[PDB]
Amino acid sequence: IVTLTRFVKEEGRKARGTGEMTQLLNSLCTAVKAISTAVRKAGIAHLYGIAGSTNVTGDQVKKLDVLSNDLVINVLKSSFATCVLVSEEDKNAIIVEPEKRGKYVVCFDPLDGSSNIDCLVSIGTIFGIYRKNSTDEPSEKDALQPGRNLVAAGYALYGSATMLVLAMVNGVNCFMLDPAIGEFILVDRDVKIKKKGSIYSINEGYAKEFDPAITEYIQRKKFPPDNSAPYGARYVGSMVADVHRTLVYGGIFMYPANKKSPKGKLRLLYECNPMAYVMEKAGGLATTGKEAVLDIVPTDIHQRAPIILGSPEDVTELLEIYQKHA
Amino acid sequence: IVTLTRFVKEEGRKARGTGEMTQLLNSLCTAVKAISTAVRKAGIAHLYGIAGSTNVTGDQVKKLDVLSNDLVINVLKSSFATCVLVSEEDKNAIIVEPEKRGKYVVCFDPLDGSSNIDCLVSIGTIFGIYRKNSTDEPSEKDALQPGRNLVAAGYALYGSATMLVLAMVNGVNCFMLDPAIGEFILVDRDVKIKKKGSIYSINEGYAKEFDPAITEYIQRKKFPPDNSAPYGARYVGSMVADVHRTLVYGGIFMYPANKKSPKGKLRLLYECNPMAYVMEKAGGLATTGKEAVLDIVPTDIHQRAPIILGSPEDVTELLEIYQKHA
Amino acid sequence: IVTLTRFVKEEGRKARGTGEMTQLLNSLCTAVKAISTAVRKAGIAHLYGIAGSTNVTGDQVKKLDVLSNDLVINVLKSSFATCVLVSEEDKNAIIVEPEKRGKYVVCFDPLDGSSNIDCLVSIGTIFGIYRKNSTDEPSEKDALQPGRNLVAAGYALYGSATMLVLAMVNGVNCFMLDPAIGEFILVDRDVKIKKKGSIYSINEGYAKEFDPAITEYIQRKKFPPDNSAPYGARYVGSMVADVHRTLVYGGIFMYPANKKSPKGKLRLLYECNPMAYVMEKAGGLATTGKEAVLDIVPTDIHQRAPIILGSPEDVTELLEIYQKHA
Amino acid sequence: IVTLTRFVKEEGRKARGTGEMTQLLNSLCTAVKAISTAVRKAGIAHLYGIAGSTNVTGDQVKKLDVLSNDLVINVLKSSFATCVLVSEEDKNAIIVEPEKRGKYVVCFDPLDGSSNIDCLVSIGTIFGIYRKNSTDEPSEKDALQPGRNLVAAGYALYGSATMLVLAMVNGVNCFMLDPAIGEFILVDRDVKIKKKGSIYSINEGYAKEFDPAITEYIQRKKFPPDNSAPYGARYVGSMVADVHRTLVYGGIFMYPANKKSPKGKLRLLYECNPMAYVMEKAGGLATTGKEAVLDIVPTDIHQRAPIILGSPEDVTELLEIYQKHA
Ligand SMILES: Nc1ncnc2c1ncn2[C@@H]1O[C@H](COP(=O)(O)O)[C@@H](O)[C@H]1O
Ligand SMILES: Nc1ncnc2c1ncn2[C@@H]1O[C@H](COP(=O)(O)O)[C@@H](O)[C@H]1O
């Protein structure tokens, strides 16, 4: 019955919004559809395999990384709502030219999941939207804000279906793409994560490098102290994919710092922050183990951060272990 | 350039085949396309949520389980090539009626991945094809054969793309579905798995129940004895999904027996056997830890079995640990 | 390169428009896509065959007539831009409720071509947009304006491809629907009709009822006075279809009054007016034979009118014959 | 419920056929789907506009003409059922190479409707299938047979929907393409044309060149002798399109010889013959005005012929006028 487009427009009314934010969200979706479609046939269009350059964070980049980076920059440019872009794949910040310039700042991972592209596992797109407070000209700085300033955030999952997850001050709603008429249809409204769950998601290959808090916690998941049944384990290897299962199943997801990565591996602007926002707006929690992720003031558009999120009873348990070892 | 249909037909020539096996493979694909399509929009068509009955193996069944079971039975019936069907969801064997009866025996998991349906993670279809040796009437027995008698086997993956993996005596080929013209297009011909890999896939929540061989092996993956870097870890929760990554990445996949499941959890006819066939035809190995899976003579259409597969240097390593503890 | 959505938005800028007119045009397209899709498979979804009621103009109505009437009313309602609707299929005017009310008046033939639905010949949608001048409450009257007040007009053709033809004060542009990503892509910008053409389109079965001007004109088409080759003849039976060929080929289209239909058969609000607007904005002409169609002040939302349009040298020729017989 | 593929296979059984004819029909459909898809987006893929060469019959050829010619030759080649091809666009006959050679002879208009390509009006594909009687090597001669030897014939219509019309000795059935799963679904089984109808289809621009029989007949359509209401008139300009409306509506279609075209304009092998077969198998009639079309022995693969077909009471009426003037 309800399309995204109806929903967003109506929300926009309720908010009295002028319309900038709404064209912006519509430009984005269209971008997502464009990607879903490329993605569902990459091999036939021979989009697997690398393009060439490595990237600021040392990521080998491949043709899909680029193709989807471009659609997006380009669709945001032409939205006429954004003055500053931030891309996984882009070394410095993109300052939109004046004629198309607006007052929104959008950070994004055009394609998360690089590992799983070739083996056809779920992939996605991550984005965050901040509003330019400042009055100086639109420099890079304007994209250095703590997540708590996010006005909107979400991700697209290209899993067994394509889905858009969007979250704003009100709450979280899930829309699915009808491949048939090319429109997103709302399927879940105002979702909330379970208070406690059954699954722990973490890459255990790093067992060697984990700190003693994570180590203990994992142990506690596998040998419950109280005899309850033990937690099940899932790690896909795509954040968007693991985070999503966690939103709708409950449980907890983990990419904490390690001996060799004091700040963990995920990127704070365009990975960590959006997900923690979503998680919190759904009734989730999202910490580094020492601080809430949204409260970190960024000093590099490309910086990394530890991320632990999901059901709040589950997250809490780890935080207490963390303090214990303090 | 090359469609499935061209390929199969040509193979059929090279084989001098009469044509039964080829209509059979074509009936199947069509079934897969039918499913992919339902699947990419289940939520819009409201196919998430359960149907009602539990199943012989105690599986909660849900609407997609059924919808895809039916398309398939029905498309195989009408292939005119099969005399005996075996379904995850079907209590006893389906004996095809004479008028449509043929000489092939097909076992199948219409939908593997039940956990991940609601969270939109990759799902698939598994199948095996045996040829009826016997001359008695077509009873259930005829589907009790060791995998080594498989004439064809494979799976469909509904991941970020839909893909058909088919394997016959010659070798393994991968085809992808062009959503646009509704035909499968061959993308990889005569694939082979790497001899040794970087990833171990297993549900570690069972850490408590593993035997001492698996335990040691996991330990050896996380703390290499020789200082090489440690293996990475992936478990999606969909066999088809994990097995596929393993075929194209190398590495190893594991659902071994545990303290509470002496024979492991995966089903030998319609899960274990096809995958081990594929794996071996690709240059893989597939054991219970004590015997090759294909060599087990089945005595129940619905029986379970331990399954360890993937790169042969990787599989070997575990077998030696297994013998060690012998 | 350019989507509809980019185009319209940009036009809207150039026009300084507040945004109402632009959400309105976007709501409409979406409606068109919805229809194209139903239409390309009506038979499979069993949309051929009648619904039940006859209609104000005595039209037998059938399931597609309804299905597309509804999508449209509903998508216009929710546009939040329109206060008064006019439907082929609707007896009296639809007054939008206040909460969704806007300042646009849209008349429309949800589905033109009824004859050719069952035989799968081209069908289309016609629409006109007027802006409410008045300050009284939004009654029906507000949709009684001469075409010259149209702020926008066009049609969708579901021919061998789906196409959107839109025309505003600037000129005419053609967009095509990419079935694949579900977006309209501009293919022809700022089109203009040829000054004189080779084709006459008219239903000659009415030969008996034509007046002496049309009769003479047809004769002159078949036996040129100057020996030039004779004009070719096309009548599909779908106005949208015939009018479109005429825009891009040149020539002339005819549904003039007859002995038994003093005012011809096509409906002025939602058929005649949009087409004449398009035609004129493309450099065409559009007369009853006695007056320009756009200049007629309507007194019934459902009234009929003669319509002759196309290349201006061609139209002129008939007008002179018309005056001759004056 | 029923797909083409089920239908054809079953028919094939009833016929005891070996299977050649059935792979052949399946190869063809696939070709049709390929075309429908190109066609529904030609403009976006920029397939409008000419390729270059003129053709044996003096036809300006354009990119779609070629693209669809190729898919088809190629898909028939690889069917392994055909030894001799005949193309609108091909100067001499295509003799299939031995390795792929079979025993069927297929004549075809890869794309009928050239006029209406640019204006997006309905277009189609026409084909005829003959079986090679002869024992000499497969030369061109083998495609010179009277239509009565056709074992199968039909056309694809890319109208507001794509449809396959197939006719064999049994009768005629209509299938529609589900754009969504890419399979043809049977919608009308064993169709029959009305005995008498309301519509005459002919290009009246040739009024000057018609003979006295056609002239009188048209006159009789416009001024009934008995006062019945007069017939309506439709000519789209695409044979496939006009012929189809005639099959399902009744009436009559006309491209008779004229003063300047003693043998009319349509091509006997790949246009005239298939349509007359269909028409007759549906309970239709199909004459030149002097002889049945199917009974003409062809002497040039590219020859032309007059064609008059449709409801038998309607066709008869003209034949009597023809004899009258004898
Ligand atoms: N479509 C919308 N959905 C939710 N909030 C909106 C929308 N449009 C405007 N707003 C609210 O109004 C603010 C400014 O939007 P804008 O009017 O484009 O500047 C945003 O930060 C939103 O919180
Ligand atoms: N399309 C095909 N692809 C591969 N092998 C085939 C094919 N058709 C027939 N064969 C071989 O011939 C055997 C019998 O097939 P059939 O002729 O249908 O009984 C199969 O076990 C295949 O090994």
Ligand SMILES: Nc1ncnc2c1ncn2[C@@H]1O[C@H](COP(=O)(O)O)[C@@H](O)[C@H]1O
């Ligand atoms: N997207 C647009 N395209 C063309 N003209 C527009 C557009 N938006 C606004 N306008 C012009 O501004 C007028 C009022 O539009 P609105 O601002 O919605 O009331 C219309 O009559 C148009 O002529």
Ligand SMILES: Nc1ncnc2c1ncn2[C@@H]1O[C@H](COP(=O)(O)O)[C@@H](O)[C@H]1O
């Ligand atoms: N699928 C089919 N549908 C209708 N007739 C068929 C079919 N297959 C075979 N036949 C009949 O058998 C003849 C030879 O076909 P084949 O067995 O391929 O040589 C044809 O002329 C048909 O009349």
Ligand SMILES: O=P(O)(O)OC[C@H]1O[C@](O)(CO)[C@@H](O)[C@@H]1O
């Ligand atoms: O393989 P690793 O080191 O566990 O990291 C995987 C992570 O990296 C990412 O590809 C982002 O770079 C995520 O999608 C995923 O969660």
Ligand SMILES: O=P(O)(O)OC[C@H]1O[C@](O)(CO)[C@@H](O)[C@@H]1O
């Ligand atoms: O959650 P578990 O117990 O690890 O089992 C998951 C397995 O079960 C299955 O759903 C098959 O029943 C597989 O797809 C998957 O590998």
Ligand SMILES: O=P(O)(O)OC[C@H]1O[C@](O)(CO)[C@@H](O)[C@@H]1O
């Ligand atoms: O069959 P007639 O009387 O010529 O009218 C056909 C016309 O009627 C319509 O269906 C509109 O009612 C047009 O699409 C078409 O041009």
Ligand SMILES: O=P(O)(O)OC[C@H]1O[C@](O)(CO)[C@@H](O)[C@@H]1O
């Ligand atoms: O424009 P004409 O001379 O009437 O011929 C149109 C005919 O030519 C064709 O394009 C075939 O060449 C047919 O589709 C159509 O019926």
Ligand SMILES: [Mg+2]
């Ligand atoms: Mg990267």
Ligand SMILES: [Mg+2]
């Ligand atoms: Mg990325």
Ligand SMILES: [Mg+2]
């Ligand atoms: Mg990423």
Ligand SMILES: [Mg+2]
């Ligand atoms: Mg189950």
Ligand SMILES: [Mg+2]
């Ligand atoms: Mg299953």
Ligand SMILES: [Mg+2]
């Ligand atoms: Mg399973």
Ligand SMILES: [Mg+2]
């Ligand atoms: Mg009507």
Ligand SMILES: [Mg+2]
């Ligand atoms: Mg209508």
Ligand SMILES: [Mg+2]
């Ligand atoms: Mg109409």
Ligand SMILES: [Mg+2]
């Ligand atoms: Mg030609």
